[PDB]
Structures are given as structure tokens and as C-alpha cells.
Amino acid sequence: SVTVKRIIDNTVIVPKLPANEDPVEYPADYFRKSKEIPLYINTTKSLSDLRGYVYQGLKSGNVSIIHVNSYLYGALKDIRGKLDKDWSSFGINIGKAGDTIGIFDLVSLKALDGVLPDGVSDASRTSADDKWLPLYLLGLYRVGRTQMPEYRKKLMDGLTNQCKMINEQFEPLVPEGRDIFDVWGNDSNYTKIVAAVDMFFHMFKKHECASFRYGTIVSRFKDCAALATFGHLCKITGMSTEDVTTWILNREVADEMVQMMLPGQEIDKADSYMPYLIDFGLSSKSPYSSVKNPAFHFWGQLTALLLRSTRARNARQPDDIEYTSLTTAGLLYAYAVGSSADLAQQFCVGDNKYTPDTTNAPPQGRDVVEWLGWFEDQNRKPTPDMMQYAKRAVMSLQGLREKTIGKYAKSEFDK
Amino acid sequence: SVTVKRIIDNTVIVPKLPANEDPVEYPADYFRKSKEIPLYINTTKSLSDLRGYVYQGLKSGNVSIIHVNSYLYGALKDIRGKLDKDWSSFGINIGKAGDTIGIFDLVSLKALDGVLPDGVSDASRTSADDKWLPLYLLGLYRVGRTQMPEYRKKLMDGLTNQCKMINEQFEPLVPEGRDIFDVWGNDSNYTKIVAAVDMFFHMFKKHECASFRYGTIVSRFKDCAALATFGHLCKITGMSTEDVTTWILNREVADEMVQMMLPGQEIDKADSYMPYLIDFGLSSKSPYSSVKNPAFHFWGQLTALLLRSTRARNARQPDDIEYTSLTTAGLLYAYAVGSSADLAQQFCVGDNKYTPTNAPPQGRDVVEWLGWFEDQNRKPTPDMMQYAKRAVMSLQGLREKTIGKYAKSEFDK
Amino acid sequence: QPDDIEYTSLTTAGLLYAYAVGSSADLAQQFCVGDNKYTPDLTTNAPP
Structure with a gap:
């Protein structure tokens, strides 16, 4: 797809479109100037x-x-x-x-x-x-x-x-x-x-x-949403930071995830300068903003909404992201975590359930691969139950502000 | 279709219709005069x-x-x-x-x-x-x-x-x-x-x-809409600039696309004069305006609306474009991108999904889809029609003469 | 709506013309990357 020709006269056309930049700027890649x-x-x-x-x-x-x-x-x-x-x-x-x-x-x-x-x-x-x-x-x-x-x-x-x-x-x-x-x-x-x-x-x-x-x-973590909608997604799915990542299923959400995770920034460090990267004037554009992570934001927030987040009803719906593929990818993830709960003896009095005793019925746990396979099998086009699942998670929400991922969700699933 | 005769008396009629011009004017094809x-x-x-x-x-x-x-x-x-x-x-x-x-x-x-x-x-x-x-x-x-x-x-x-x-x-x-x-x-x-x-x-x-x-x-990109509704269409379909182009399916949208893309104008250049072609008085009529790109505008904006753009609910609906064929062409494109997601494992821990009639194509190739549409009577299926309905019903606050109010009237009923 | 014209025949004549242009779109690949649908690959009563 580098060279495009026009059939009727067989001439070349060169699809370009306006520039756009302002890179982000990281904390560390700053203290390498002034100290x-x-x-x-x-x-x-x-x-x-x-x-x-x-x-x-x-x-x-x-x-x-x-x-x-x-x-x-x-x-x-x-x-x-x-x-x-x-x-x-x-x-x-x-x-x-x-x-x-x-x-x-x-x-x-x-x-x-x-x-x-x-x-x-x-x-x-x-x-x-x-x-x-x-x-x-x-x-x-x-x-x-x-x-x-x-x-x-x-x-x-x-x-x-x-x-x-x-x-x-x-x-x-x-x-x-x-x-x-x-x-x-x-x-x-x-x-x-x-x-x-x-x-x-x-x-x-x-x-x-x-x-x-x-x-x-x-002031703490100002202009740092994404990188914290991410910890909210972990908490609400009960998954590990590493397992959540594996369930990222679209190029940009992945690109964006790498962006936020690039090392030597002390994001995980106890008391560092990083949280204040914006108000200390360490950085003018934040690598961790919900605006330089629009897909990761819509994804992680839609997903958490399906999983019963209240915080997420009122997240704002970014523009210029790929809505349809992003949402399906989040429905899949929500439907995984949602159907196959979380269930498991923790205490006992000498006796305890030793657990490990149809086709087309969806996978047993929450492995990204088992599920991705079951979705292949299903025509990469969501079943009518996972669609019913979404409906039960959005119908019966109210007070929905225009341009929130919540009003987005109810319009897309309740009907 | 050059010569038209009238059957009843077999005389010649010459269908002409009023002139209309004002060419566009490009940045470059200006600095070739003054410098x-x-x-x-x-x-x-x-x-x-x-x-x-x-x-x-x-x-x-x-x-x-x-x-x-x-x-x-x-x-x-x-x-x-x-x-x-x-x-x-x-x-x-x-x-x-x-x-x-x-x-x-x-x-x-x-x-x-x-x-x-x-x-x-x-x-x-x-x-x-x-x-x-x-x-x-x-x-x-x-x-x-x-x-x-x-x-x-x-x-x-x-x-x-x-x-x-x-x-x-x-x-x-x-x-x-x-x-x-x-x-x-x-x-x-x-x-x-x-x-x-x-x-x-x-x-x-x-x-x-x-x-x-x-x-x-x-001031930047004044009277330059089209050439930027175009990047918005790319962003919202997740497709490449080149792959989007291939999905243009009507003569004018294609004509218009060529118009905007004609080379040596620095449209893709970092900091050039071009964005200001209008306010620097480099150009009086813009090649990149949504008014010299009315079909490409209706098309790209309708399509993006079907794919959930909010930006697009309020785009204005050009006159003197071919509405029916342009919309169908955009429905097809919307339905393609919409049904077949681009899922695909991106991270793993040593294990990963090695992925590889009349039910629509698997990916987003312009040809596979064009063929499936041929098969369907070049007359949209009742699902792709249901698709459009779900994307427009439940929109409100719709101004008269926007491609949004156009879409809801055409698909919600 | 002008007066003193032949309404019924005029409208039918316009319905036909609208139905023509409306059902059979003018789709056709315009751009490609080396591959393109070479298009010219019911019985009866289904319209032209």
C-alpha cells in the first residue's frame, strides 16, 4: 500500500494529509538538561x-x-x-x-x-x-x-x-x-x-x-489520567498488571501503552518528581494524558463501564479514535471477566473443594488466547449473549452527560 | 452520448447548460509569479x-x-x-x-x-x-x-x-x-x-x-476543511492513508481527491506557508475547501458519522452532489469497517493466538467487499441497513442541513 | 407545483427515473494498490 494508481487513466496519486506533531516530553528526558x-x-x-x-x-x-x-x-x-x-x-x-x-x-x-x-x-x-x-x-x-x-x-x-x-x-x-x-x-x-x-x-x-x-x-498526577485509568482497569477486573496488558487488542491501545510504560520515569516510584511533571514545568505535553492516550482511554474506560464502574459513566469520549473496533475489543474483554467470575475456596475446616474434576460454549478462564480463539470461531462477530451482557450493563444507567463514554455505551447497547 | 436526436421528428437537440468556473488556485502555482x-x-x-x-x-x-x-x-x-x-x-x-x-x-x-x-x-x-x-x-x-x-x-x-x-x-x-x-x-x-x-x-x-x-x-488551514476531514476519516477507520483512498467509490470523490492531493504544495510539510494559503492572500479560491470538495465531504463525513464520529453530527450537507450513490458508497464503507473489527493479540507471556456463502468478507479489502456487494444485487442487505439504523437512531439536537440530520432521516425509520 | 400540467404521467415518469438512479448505484473501485475488482464477472423481472 505505498503506491496508489488510479484505474481509469492509470496515473499516480499520492495520498498525503496535513502534518501534526507536538511530541510528548518525559520527566527524565528533562533533568538531562537543567538539574x-x-x-x-x-x-x-x-x-x-x-x-x-x-x-x-x-x-x-x-x-x-x-x-x-x-x-x-x-x-x-x-x-x-x-x-x-x-x-x-x-x-x-x-x-x-x-x-x-x-x-x-x-x-x-x-x-x-x-x-x-x-x-x-x-x-x-x-x-x-x-x-x-x-x-x-x-x-x-x-x-x-x-x-x-x-x-x-x-x-x-x-x-x-x-x-x-x-x-x-x-x-x-x-x-x-x-x-x-x-x-x-x-x-x-x-x-x-x-x-x-x-x-x-x-x-x-x-x-x-x-x-x-x-x-x-x-496537582499530583495532573494531566496524567490514562496512566491511572489503567490502574483502575486492573482493580476492577481483578487481573494483574501484566495480564491486563495481554488483553490489549488494538494497535493504538498497544502503541499508547508502550508510550506510557517506557522505562526510567519513576512512575512506580514512591515519592518522586514525576507526578508533578506538569506543575513543576518538567513537561509541557504529558506522555500520560488521556489526550495522548485516546484509544487506551476509550478502551480502558468503556471496559470498566461494562464491568460496573461508576467512576466511568462520566469519562469523556475522545474524538479521532477507531470507535467500532475499540468497543468490540472491550466488549470481548468485559464479557470474559464478566461471565467467568472468580470462584474459589479460600478457607476450610479440613475439607475443601478440589476443583479440577459443549462446543461453542465460551472459554473457562480469562486467557487472552483461549478467548481470542473462541472469537475467531464465532465469526469475529460478537454472539447475541455477549451483546445481551452489554445491554444489561448499560440499560438502567441515567443522568448521562453528552460526550461521555457512558452515554456512548448506553446508545450503543441499550436498544 | 454526444449526439441527441428527438425521435418524433428526428431533429437534433444540443443539451447545454449555463457556464461555471472559478478554478481553484494553489500555493505553489503562485510563488511562480511574485516571490x-x-x-x-x-x-x-x-x-x-x-x-x-x-x-x-x-x-x-x-x-x-x-x-x-x-x-x-x-x-x-x-x-x-x-x-x-x-x-x-x-x-x-x-x-x-x-x-x-x-x-x-x-x-x-x-x-x-x-x-x-x-x-x-x-x-x-x-x-x-x-x-x-x-x-x-x-x-x-x-x-x-x-x-x-x-x-x-x-x-x-x-x-x-x-x-x-x-x-x-x-x-x-x-x-x-x-x-x-x-x-x-x-x-x-x-x-x-x-x-x-x-x-x-x-x-x-x-x-x-x-x-x-x-x-x-x-488562521491555519482556513478554508481547508476537506483535506482534513480526510485525516479524520483515516483516524476513525484505523486505516492507512493509502487504504482509505482505495475505498473511494465514486467519480467525483475520486476527482476531488486527486485535486487535493496534486503534488508540490507542501500539504504534508512541517512548517510551510501552505496552511495559510488564504490569509496570506496566496490563493483566493482554495483547492482544499469543503466547497470545492462537496462529494468528498459528504462522503467522508457521512461515513465517519456511521462509525460514531461526534465531530460529524454537525457537518453541513452540500448541495448539488449525488446524494443516493454517495451515501450507499459510504454505507458499504462504514459497514465494512464496522462489522469486521481489527482485533489481534498484541502482548503475550510465551503463548499467543496463531489466528489463521453470502456472509460478508473477512477483512477490509475494497475488492472482496465490492464483489460481495455485486453478489448482493448492488442493493444493500437488511443488516447493513440495520447497522446504519443503530448508528443514527438515538442521536439528538440535530441542526437542519447537517449530514447528521440527513443520516437520521435516511436511516431511522 | 405548476398548474395546468399533466400530473399523473409526469410523476410516474419521474418515479421511474428516480427508481432507476436510486436502486442501481454507480459504485466502482477508483483507487488500488496493484489489485482491483475486475467487475464484469437473477433470471427475470428483476429490474435493469
């Missing part, structure tokens, strides 16, 4: 000064993001953690056992000049500070990431945590739609702080100020 | 002066487009990019590796006289400039291209990006229907700037000011 993560807190005025600027700037739609960065740096050197063991990652040697380290032991610089209001913008605010002002500012990042009315949901919830240890309350004013302090997420230095805070308190899960992670969390 | 793309920034007053003219003219329905062109030229010579490799296109040698180039390294001239308000139209605005005023002005191009209430959608969205690195509200006033600053798109020199900005930041995807592409993007 530090730069945090441009440009300015160091005064913590007290800053405490004020914000406190007020916060009852107004024009608190400067260069200020909060500085208040946070200001309020957050509780260099307040002791490594019980070593800490490394991608070469970068964070610390060594017994040691004492603090959040910003991830590489601070400073830069460009003129900051906004001067001196002391209200001297009234006191050391109600490390207590709650930071936690609130960090919390806001999380509330910023969502567009939907669930936002003032996380806000209501995400404002009762300051009440803790100090009782506080609300500050802003305006609604959302990314505008009130949502630009915050776009400040390359704001994220580097929320990322370092989350990462720090992942290591010292036990700390008193560990509470901060409230809004600092959704 | 430069002229950007008539007529005037050069002062950047500071200009910064003002706009800032005010913007809180009013009469800022002159000759002014924004100039403010932009003014604010945009961040000659701020280094070629890691060579850059060429259609002969025109943009630069050479290691080099430093800036946006307007695509051929500036100047012309005709008298400009509008003089001197300094408010001296108050400061160097809040390269920061955001341009990005906003460019942004507007995008908001201008749409007629539907989704416009103030892109505007809401498209105004939060200035907040970034600077922050402060929206300028205009009036609603749109092409009038408030939508005439902007019609300024031959405005487009040439938005095109050169987009093209420049496509090459240096990594730049700090690359953010500008927010509204500068929908």
Missing part, C-alpha cells in the same frame, strides 16, 4: 508587609499573584521535616537520612523588579498566618481547576478547614469561570509552589501542617 | 502614539483598522527566535540554522497616505503592551469568524488570557453579527499579520510570547 527546578520569587519585601497586601487584596479583584507567591514563600519555611531514609530522584539529590529539610529544598531563585503597593498595606493583620492564610491560598488552586457549579461545592467544603485551628472564613466576591483568582493556575511560579508543597507533604504524610494538601493535591 | 508576501503597513507614526489611538478607539465603534495594523507591527518585533535548523518553502528562503528571525521576516512594504487622529490621542497608556494589547487584538480575529452565540463564548474564554501576566477588563460595547471589529478579517493586511504571527509561533512552539496564537490559530 534544578527554578522558583522565581522575584522579590523579597517583608513577610508582615505581605501578610497585609494579600489580606486586603483578597477582599478585591486585583490582589497580585506576585504577592501571594511571596506571602507563601514567606509563610512556608517550616523547614520542618526529618528524613527517616534517603531521598533521591532523576539524579537530583534532595537529602540524606536523619537530615532536616523544608518545602523549598527544591531550588529557589529571584528576579525582575517593580512590585505593586509599597511599605505596609494595612498593619492590622497578626500572626494568624502559618495557621491558615497559606492553606486558604493553596486551597484556591483546586477550586480554580473546575468550570462547573461543583466549584462553589469544593469551596464551601474547602473553607471549613481553616475554621480548624483558627476559624476563619470567606474573602473574595465574584463568581468564577476562571477570572477571580483562576489566572493563578497559570502563574508558572504559583504552581511550582503548590507542587512542592504537595510533594513535600506526600513524603511527610504525618506532619502537623500536612493539612495544607487540601487544594495542593489535585 | 514575496507584501505587508502594506502604509504608515509609520509612533508606537507610543498608536498605543493610545487604539486604547481609546477601542472603547468606541470606530477604531481604524489601519491603526491596529500599525500598533501590531509596532508591538511585535520581538525578532525573538533562533532557528535550530533550516527554514524554506516554495523557494522563499526564510532563514538558515543558528539564525535569528522575527515575525515580520515575511516581507514588509508601506503605502498610501492620510491617517486619522494626529499627534498623541491620550498619552496615559503605558508599556502594558507586548504584554497583552496585541494578544487581545489578535484574539478578536477569532471571535469575529463566528456568527452564532458561541461567539461571546470564545470571548468570555478569550479574555481570561490577558488577565495572565497583566490583568484588566473588556473594551468594545456592541454585539456582533460582523460589525464591531469583524470587518477586521476583511483587511488584507490584518490577516497577513495574524497569519505570519501564527506561522511564526508554530515554528517556535516554545516561545514566551507564543501565547498569542490564541486567536491567531483559526
Whole structure:
């Protein structure tokens, strides 16, 4: 299929189509350039000064993001953690056992000049500070990431945590739609702080100020869906990471799987930089995103939906993937795991079922080959029971948003 | 069928019908005339002066487009990019590796006289400039291209990006229907700037000011649908670009396909001028438009709809194409790809499945299938008809004159 | 719908022409990779 000719006049035609690139970029294949993560807190005025600027700037739609960065740096050197063991990652040697380290032991610089209001913008605010002002500012990042009315949901919830240890309350004013302090997420230095805070308190899960992670969390594995819809597929099929892989049955899902699994990235490592590859600015395009893994996403999510996932009803249905072959491949996989359950004596009182005592009736376990063979036999065209199976798994779902793999599934199987 | 006679009196009739032309025009078959793309920034007053003219003219329905062109030229010579490799296109040698180039390294001239308000139209605005005023002005191009209430959608969205690195509200006033600053798109020199900005930041995807592409993007592949519904059809059938072509089954779709594929146009080239063939005024009628590719459009889009495209529910249904034969041809193609999956073991642990009348073909070969269709009376079976029904029933929110509303009316009943 | 035309015969004449063009499509391989369906490989009353 390299050379295409046109029958009627026997001339050559050369089917090409527009380019398309932006490669992904991996964590490791970055620390091979720079070996530090730069945090441009440009300015160091005064913590007290800053405490004020914000406190007020916060009852107004024009608190400067260069200020909060500085208040946070200001309020957050509780260099307040002791490594019980070593800490490394991608070469970068964070610390060594017994040691004492603090959040910003991830590489601070400073830069460009003129900051906004001067001196002391209200001297009234006191050391109600490390207590709650930071936690609130960090919390806001999380509330910023969502567009939907669930936002003032996380806000209501995400404002009762300051009440803790100090009782506080609300500050802003305006609604959302990314505008009130949502630009915050776009400040390359704001994220580097929320990322370092989350990462720090992942290591010292036990700390008193560990509470901060409230809004600092959704930083972890940002733009890393696929590589975690994958662990959800494992959990829901009760299969092993290696057995799941074998059941991948389409070129792209396989291509995509390799992509995510390429070694030396510490994806499986306890506390590494990798989860934060996006907010530390380690990577601009994520190898682990549900957008560079569209087939693996539709596949793994459709499959989990058939297997009774609730999480999956509301996954979004990628465009420009091969829908029909992808779904059949997931029906097969769902039907395998679904019919041949999981059944097996585990405890006994001296007696126990020693188990290993028609054609066209489907395979006994969950081997990719036995099943692939039975499907060959069936005309590589799904039986009316595995089709009935799908129907029973999607009929009786409701509240289905447009363009979710759930609304996709019910339209395709319920009728 | 050259000579038609009329039986009853045996005289000759000569069926002719009204003319119709405007050929397309290709990129390459243009740089064979001129070898430069002229950007008539007529005037050069002062950047500071200009910064003002706009800032005010913007809180009013009469800022002159000759002014924004100039403010932009003014604010945009961040000659701020280094070629890691060579850059060429259609002969025109943009630069050479290691080099430093800036946006307007695509051929500036100047012309005709008298400009509008003089001197300094408010001296108050400061160097809040390269920061955001341009990005906003460019942004507007995008908001201008749409007629539907989704416009103030892109505007809401498209105004939060200035907040970034600077922050402060929206300028205009009036609603749109092409009038408030939508005439902007019609300024031959405005487009040439938005095109050169987009093209420049496509090459240096990594730049700090690359953010500008927010509204500068929908310039790329403007009036170039077909030649990209085509890649969408490939993606959605999992087939190769060459294998898809073989499944073209009607004269015009084939004619149209040749048209788009004619060589020496850099359509497949990384960063070329071609995507902008329309806004650089390289071409007035596009070879790659869904209007000079109406059959290839109906075909590829109908087919992709049957295969579950969401993108395609809302494609518009061309007029003056051969509907019945085109759809059947797409049903066949959809039914092929649809029934016979491309399953196949991809990973294993030492063991793996060694895989190898009137019931349809095993794979997706154009010939096996064409033969099975011959056998079936070249009149689609009642399953492939049931197939189509399951792919269209249960669609809703269907706009009039989309290939989606076309499909559901044709198959759901 | 014009008046003073012969409706019944005109419509039948158009049904025939629509039914022709409608049932028998104009399928035919257009592109190939070295292989292509050489097409010209019921009894009665089944239409042309």
C-alpha cells in the first residue's frame, strides 16, 4: 500500500494529509538538561508587609499573584521535616537520612523588579498566618481547576478547614469561570509552589501542617489520567498488571501503552518528581494524558463501564479514535471477566473443594488466547449473549452527560 | 452520448447548460509569479502614539483598522527566535540554522497616505503592551469568524488570557453579527499579520510570547476543511492513508481527491506557508475547501458519522452532489469497517493466538467487499441497513442541513 | 407545483427515473494498490 494508481487513466496519486506533531516530553528526558527546578520569587519585601497586601487584596479583584507567591514563600519555611531514609530522584539529590529539610529544598531563585503597593498595606493583620492564610491560598488552586457549579461545592467544603485551628472564613466576591483568582493556575511560579508543597507533604504524610494538601493535591498526577485509568482497569477486573496488558487488542491501545510504560520515569516510584511533571514545568505535553492516550482511554474506560464502574459513566469520549473496533475489543474483554467470575475456596475446616474434576460454549478462564480463539470461531462477530451482557450493563444507567463514554455505551447497547 | 436526436421528428437537440468556473488556485502555482508576501503597513507614526489611538478607539465603534495594523507591527518585533535548523518553502528562503528571525521576516512594504487622529490621542497608556494589547487584538480575529452565540463564548474564554501576566477588563460595547471589529478579517493586511504571527509561533512552539496564537490559530488551514476531514476519516477507520483512498467509490470523490492531493504544495510539510494559503492572500479560491470538495465531504463525513464520529453530527450537507450513490458508497464503507473489527493479540507471556456463502468478507479489502456487494444485487442487505439504523437512531439536537440530520432521516425509520 | 400540467404521467415518469438512479448505484473501485475488482464477472423481472 505505498503506491496508489488510479484505474481509469492509470496515473499516480499520492495520498498525503496535513502534518501534526507536538511530541510528548518525559520527566527524565528533562533533568538531562537543567538539574534544578527554578522558583522565581522575584522579590523579597517583608513577610508582615505581605501578610497585609494579600489580606486586603483578597477582599478585591486585583490582589497580585506576585504577592501571594511571596506571602507563601514567606509563610512556608517550616523547614520542618526529618528524613527517616534517603531521598533521591532523576539524579537530583534532595537529602540524606536523619537530615532536616523544608518545602523549598527544591531550588529557589529571584528576579525582575517593580512590585505593586509599597511599605505596609494595612498593619492590622497578626500572626494568624502559618495557621491558615497559606492553606486558604493553596486551597484556591483546586477550586480554580473546575468550570462547573461543583466549584462553589469544593469551596464551601474547602473553607471549613481553616475554621480548624483558627476559624476563619470567606474573602473574595465574584463568581468564577476562571477570572477571580483562576489566572493563578497559570502563574508558572504559583504552581511550582503548590507542587512542592504537595510533594513535600506526600513524603511527610504525618506532619502537623500536612493539612495544607487540601487544594495542593489535585496537582499530583495532573494531566496524567490514562496512566491511572489503567490502574483502575486492573482493580476492577481483578487481573494483574501484566495480564491486563495481554488483553490489549488494538494497535493504538498497544502503541499508547508502550508510550506510557517506557522505562526510567519513576512512575512506580514512591515519592518522586514525576507526578508533578506538569506543575513543576518538567513537561509541557504529558506522555500520560488521556489526550495522548485516546484509544487506551476509550478502551480502558468503556471496559470498566461494562464491568460496573461508576467512576466511568462520566469519562469523556475522545474524538479521532477507531470507535467500532475499540468497543468490540472491550466488549470481548468485559464479557470474559464478566461471565467467568472468580470462584474459589479460600478457607476450610479440613475439607475443601478440589476443583479440577459443549462446543461453542465460551472459554473457562480469562486467557487472552483461549478467548481470542473462541472469537475467531464465532465469526469475529460478537454472539447475541455477549451483546445481551452489554445491554444489561448499560440499560438502567441515567443522568448521562453528552460526550461521555457512558452515554456512548448506553446508545450503543441499550436498544 | 454526444449526439441527441428527438425521435418524433428526428431533429437534433444540443443539451447545454449555463457556464461555471472559478478554478481553484494553489500555493505553489503562485510563488511562480511574485516571490514575496507584501505587508502594506502604509504608515509609520509612533508606537507610543498608536498605543493610545487604539486604547481609546477601542472603547468606541470606530477604531481604524489601519491603526491596529500599525500598533501590531509596532508591538511585535520581538525578532525573538533562533532557528535550530533550516527554514524554506516554495523557494522563499526564510532563514538558515543558528539564525535569528522575527515575525515580520515575511516581507514588509508601506503605502498610501492620510491617517486619522494626529499627534498623541491620550498619552496615559503605558508599556502594558507586548504584554497583552496585541494578544487581545489578535484574539478578536477569532471571535469575529463566528456568527452564532458561541461567539461571546470564545470571548468570555478569550479574555481570561490577558488577565495572565497583566490583568484588566473588556473594551468594545456592541454585539456582533460582523460589525464591531469583524470587518477586521476583511483587511488584507490584518490577516497577513495574524497569519505570519501564527506561522511564526508554530515554528517556535516554545516561545514566551507564543501565547498569542490564541486567536491567531483559526488562521491555519482556513478554508481547508476537506483535506482534513480526510485525516479524520483515516483516524476513525484505523486505516492507512493509502487504504482509505482505495475505498473511494465514486467519480467525483475520486476527482476531488486527486485535486487535493496534486503534488508540490507542501500539504504534508512541517512548517510551510501552505496552511495559510488564504490569509496570506496566496490563493483566493482554495483547492482544499469543503466547497470545492462537496462529494468528498459528504462522503467522508457521512461515513465517519456511521462509525460514531461526534465531530460529524454537525457537518453541513452540500448541495448539488449525488446524494443516493454517495451515501450507499459510504454505507458499504462504514459497514465494512464496522462489522469486521481489527482485533489481534498484541502482548503475550510465551503463548499467543496463531489466528489463521453470502456472509460478508473477512477483512477490509475494497475488492472482496465490492464483489460481495455485486453478489448482493448492488442493493444493500437488511443488516447493513440495520447497522446504519443503530448508528443514527438515538442521536439528538440535530441542526437542519447537517449530514447528521440527513443520516437520521435516511436511516431511522 | 405548476398548474395546468399533466400530473399523473409526469410523476410516474419521474418515479421511474428516480427508481432507476436510486436502486442501481454507480459504485466502482477508483483507487488500488496493484489489485482491483475486475467487475464484469437473477433470471427475470428483476429490474435493469
